[PDB]
Amino acid sequence: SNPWKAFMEKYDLERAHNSGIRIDLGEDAEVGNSKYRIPAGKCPVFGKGIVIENSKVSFLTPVATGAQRLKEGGFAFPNDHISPITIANLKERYKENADLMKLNDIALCKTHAASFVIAEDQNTNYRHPAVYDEKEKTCYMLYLSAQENMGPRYCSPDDAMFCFKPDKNEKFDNLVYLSKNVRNDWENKCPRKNLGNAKFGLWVDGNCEEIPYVNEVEARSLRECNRIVFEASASDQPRQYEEELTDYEKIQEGFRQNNRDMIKSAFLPVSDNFKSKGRGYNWANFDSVNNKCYIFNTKPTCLINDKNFFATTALSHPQEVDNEFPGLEQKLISEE
């Protein structure tokens, strides 16, 4: 009988998250004529952002408009004043909604972004993803659901181009990448902090054993190990994915022309086998002393108390640590 069973439910990311992490495109959504995939993840992704190649422009900057080339803007809404919105203004806006007033900041931000529809559209399941900036208490609505455009035709050393990749780096620490499906009760159902003095294990015959199969990768810090596991996690799109028909000029035209459907579907792949459903190398045990990152793809079912280690996941914050090792395995002993 496993004492860890309920505690470990939040580390069952196939069930907890149920979509891609590095690239989340787990749900089919109609945009105009065609069917595309959009983020479907039920867990927030802490520390994740989109990096635009050869651009100093943040992806949180609004999408290009008018004269601006694609590379002069980001992925966000260009502004009813709905994005970027602060949590103060958010709380103010929905003060009459009881249910929304019981939501935490991250859930409120996601709820706000996922609420906006075009009435004159044939009520689709498409909704905009979000990015919550915890430091600034600001909620961004993303115009683009697309997470990576790194294909070797256009996105190899050869300016009218718009190449981008998902990434975890210091500039993104306080960001939370949010799909329209992020759980309101994510705080109890999803990971956030790295578990200090802990390593994930597998409950076998009344004891917490090591993960049977792992991939050792060199990592010099907690940040580095957390980045490795994100980079190896469940992905809904293969690396270097590219479509032949992709026309940057038509796309850039659609943006300058404020064509909502073209902007919305920009760089999105068009099948069910491309969906990870949460399966992948999502967990890692970082050995802070020997500088090793042991990534694995089978869900952990217990924790081992080991002061040399940290238990991280692809969803987890790049730095935040919970050093409180759970005592749920400690037994009552008698003085007698």
CB half-sphere exposure, 46, CA atoms < 13 A: 22
- State the residue for tokens 């479907």: 40
**Rounded Cα distance, 134 and 151, in Å:** 32
Per DSSP bridges, beta strands 138-141 and 85-86 are antiparallel
**Rounded Cα distance, 20 and 23, in Å:** 5
**Rounded Cα distance, 164 and 162, in Å:** 7
Q: Which phi-psi region, left, alpha or beta, contains residue 32 (left: φ > 0; alpha: ψ -120 to 50)? A: left
- The domain limits of the chain are 1-17+185-232+279-329, 18-184+233-278
**Rounded Cα distance, 190 and 54, in Å:** 34
Q: Which residues contact 162 (CB under 8 A, 6 or more apart)?
A: 52, 70, 71, 149, 248, 251, 267
- Greatest CA separation found in the chain? 82
Per DSSP bridges, beta strands 85-86 and 164-168 are unpaired
**Rounded Cα distance, 138 and 108, in Å:** 11
Which tokens belong to 277? 């459903």
Which tokens belong to 34? 């065609």
**Rounded Cα distance, 78 and 193, in Å:** 32
The resolution in angstroms reads 2.5
CB atoms within 10 A of CB 205: 5
- CB 314 within 8 Å of CB 234: yes
**Rounded Cα distance, 73 and 67, in Å:** 11
Distances (CA, A) of 45 to 24, 147, 277, 285: 10, 13, 15, 18
**Rounded Cα distance, 250 and 257, in Å:** 10
CB half-sphere exposure, 115, CA atoms < 13 A: 11
Q: Could you give the strand order of the β-sheet that contains 130-133, starting from the edge strand earlier in sequence?
A: 45-46, 175-178, 130-133, 138-141, 85-86
Instruction: Domain 1-17+185-232+279-329: state its class.
Output: alpha beta
Per DSSP bridges, beta strands 302-313 and 283-287 are antiparallel
**Rounded Cα distance, 72 and 65, in Å:** 9
Distances (CA, A) of 114 to 53, 127, 277: 28, 5, 21
SS (H, E, C) the chain: CCCCCCHHHHHCHHHHCCCCCCECCCEEEEECCEEEEECCCCCCEECEEEEECCCCCCCCCECCCCCCCHHHCCCECCCCCCCCEEHHHHHHHCCCCHHHHCCCHHHHHHHHHCCCCCCCCCCCCCCCCEEEECCCCEEEEECCCCCCECCCCCCCCCCCCCCEEEEECHHHCCEEEECCCCCCCHHHHCCCCEEEEEEEEEEECCEEECCCCCEEEECCCHHHHHHHHHHHCCECCCCCCCCCCCCHHHHHHHHHCCCHHHHHHCCCCCCHHHCCCCCCCCEEEEECCCCEEEEECCCCCEEEEEEEEEEEECCCCCCCEECCCCCCCCCCCCCC
Per DSSP bridges, beta strands 321-322 and 194-204 are parallel
Per the DSSP assignment, residues forming a β-bridge with 138 are 86, 133
Which tokens belong to 295? 């990534």
- Report which residue type is found at 196: G
CB atoms within 10 A of CB 301: 21
Output the CA torsion sign for 26, 317, 224, 289. Answer: negative
Distances (CA, A) of 24 to 21, 44, 129, 199: 5, 11, 10, 26
Cis peptide before 84 (omega within 30 of 0): yes
Which tokens belong to 38? 């959009």
